[PDB]
Design a protein around this ligand. Structure first.
Ligand code: CA
Ligand code: CA
Length: 476
């Protein structure tokens, strides 16, 4: 699928090793601090696709698929897929090639998409960079395709960042020399064939900051599908310019500010609003960014606050602002894991409870997003406008005039206190009929052009023309 078509998708990110077992167990032990394989497979995913599909996701993002280093170390095992050694083989722990193709077919058969995580930057090696045995790698069995060993010592130094090696002294990450024609060739063929053999619909690229930007255009082009890169940094000025060579980037700038605005009743709304404006100014298409509020590399949102109203609000935000929403398996179950590896809890230990508070919230949010898209073809590409803010509130408008969706967010918390807010600035006129989708409340705009918004227990509120909701069954 191309970038333009990816815009209307919703993705569930899971760690192949942590989501589901081929034996369907709900009880298989998984001590995270141990950093070993707990046993998830591509068949375990297939086996729980109903679970995923009931929250209304259209796509999944899975861990890398290549064969890894086989050892156990004080750094743990390669259960995450980021320590590869032989690229033309599969991670036999996850299953067989046939199994990977069956995942692809099972998804497509449901109207779902497959997104795969890929690592162009490095190889993995159980030993320090001085003693790497290049004979273990396929096809890169020569120290010649790699950059000279150095650790990344100074992160402000972008050359050093691109040319020295990720990792430490227990498990080193042999850094490929991606400027070399032979390594661009290997990699461009490799990604065209990956897509063609397993029918991938889109790619998630690891360590984009660690690769020179000119590598990316012929890699985007050889794969023939949307590419979203990981540039792990909070500065839009550093990660937006990559949108010049990739298509999309993961929305790390918004991540940090969303997290803090919502962790408490005193979190900063100003900070969020300013970051919206900065990204819209540096990024060529914010609607092509991957939005998230948790992932496998930072503490879980529930580790900072266990308030459910705060949790609902960051979820409405990822789905209803500009960009593609991405939920990290566990999120829907209110997983509380902190620092890595504490945040890599097995989903199966939740028992796949489809009646969890957040399971339901995401399913309703997904319905809403799908309704808006179905009703205004210019909705998804329309730029988001944060039109009102106060110390605990942000209201945003998106969609064609006469049709815009209005989203109202609050960081007051469960403590809340019911009141009505008179939202000015919507662009809707006097007497327009709206329906608040989460409560099914019908409201009429003021003679002055105000929307009286019923606020309670600091929960999100979303309004669409009554007309539209009346054409669905969000509201009976
Ligand atoms: Ca590099
Ligand atoms: Ca990474």
């Amino acid at each position: 699928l191309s970038a333009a078509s990816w815009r209307t998708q919703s993705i569930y990110f899971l760690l192949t090793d942590r989501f589901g077992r081929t034996d369907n167990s709900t009880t298989a032990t998984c001590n995270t601090g141990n950093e070993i394989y707990c046993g998830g497979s591509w068949q375990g995913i297939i086996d729980h696709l109903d679970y995923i599909e009931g929250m209304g996701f259209t796509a999944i993002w899975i861990s890398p698929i290549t064969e890894q280093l086989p050892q156990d170390t004080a750094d743990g095992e390669a259960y995450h897929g980021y320590w590869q050694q032989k690229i033309y083989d599969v991670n036999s722990n996850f299953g067989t090639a046939d199994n990977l193709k069956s995942l692809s077919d099972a998804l497509h058969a449901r109207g779902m998409y497959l997104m795969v995580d890929v690592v162009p930057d490095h190889m993995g090696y159980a030993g320090n960079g001085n003693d790497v045995d290049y004979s273990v790698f396929d096809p890169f069995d020569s120290s010649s395709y790699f950059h000279p060993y150095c650790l990344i010592t100074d992160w402000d130094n972008l050359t050093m960042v691109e040319d020295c090696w990720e990792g430490d002294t227990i498990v080193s990450l042999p850094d490929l020399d991606t400027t070399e024609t032979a390594v661009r060739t290997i990699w461009y063929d490799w990604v065209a064939d990956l897509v063609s053999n397993y029918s991938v619909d889109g790619l998630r690229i690891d360590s984009v900051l660690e690769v020179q930007p000119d590598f990316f255009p012929g890699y985007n082009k050889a794969s023939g599908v949307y590419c979203v890169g990981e540039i792990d940094n909070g500065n839009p000025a550093s990660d937006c310019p990559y949108q010049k060579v990739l298509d999309g980037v993961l929305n790390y700038p918004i991540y940090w500010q969303l997290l803090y605005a919502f962790e408490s009743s005193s979190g900063s709304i100003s900070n969020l609003y300013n970051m919206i404006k900065s990204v819209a100014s540096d990024c060529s298409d914010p609607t092509l960014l991957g939005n998230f509020i948790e992932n496998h590399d930072n503490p879980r949102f529930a580790k900072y606050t266990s308030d459910y109203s705060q949790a609902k609000n960051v979820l409405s935000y990822i789905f209803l602002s500009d960009g593609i929403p991405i939920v990290y398996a566990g999120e829907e179950q209110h997983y509380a894991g902190g620092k890595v590896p504490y945040n890599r809890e097995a989903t199966w230990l939740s028992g796949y409870d489809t009646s969890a508070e957040l399971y339901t919230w995401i399913a309703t949010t997904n319905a809403i997003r799908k309704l808006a898209i179905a009703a205004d073809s210019a909705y998804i590409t329309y730029a988001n406008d944060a039109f009102y803010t106060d110390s605990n509130t942000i209201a945003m408008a998106k969609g064609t005039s006469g049709s815009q969706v209005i989203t109202v967010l609050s960081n007051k918390g469960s403590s809340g206190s019911s009141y009505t807010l008179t939202l000015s600035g919507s662009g809707y006129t006097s007497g327009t009929k709206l329906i608040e989708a989460y409560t099914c409340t019908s409201v009429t705009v003021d003679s002055s052009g105000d929307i009286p918004v019923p606020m309670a227990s600091g929960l999100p509120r979303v309004l669409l023309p009554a007309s539209v909701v009346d054409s669905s069954s969000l509201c009976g």
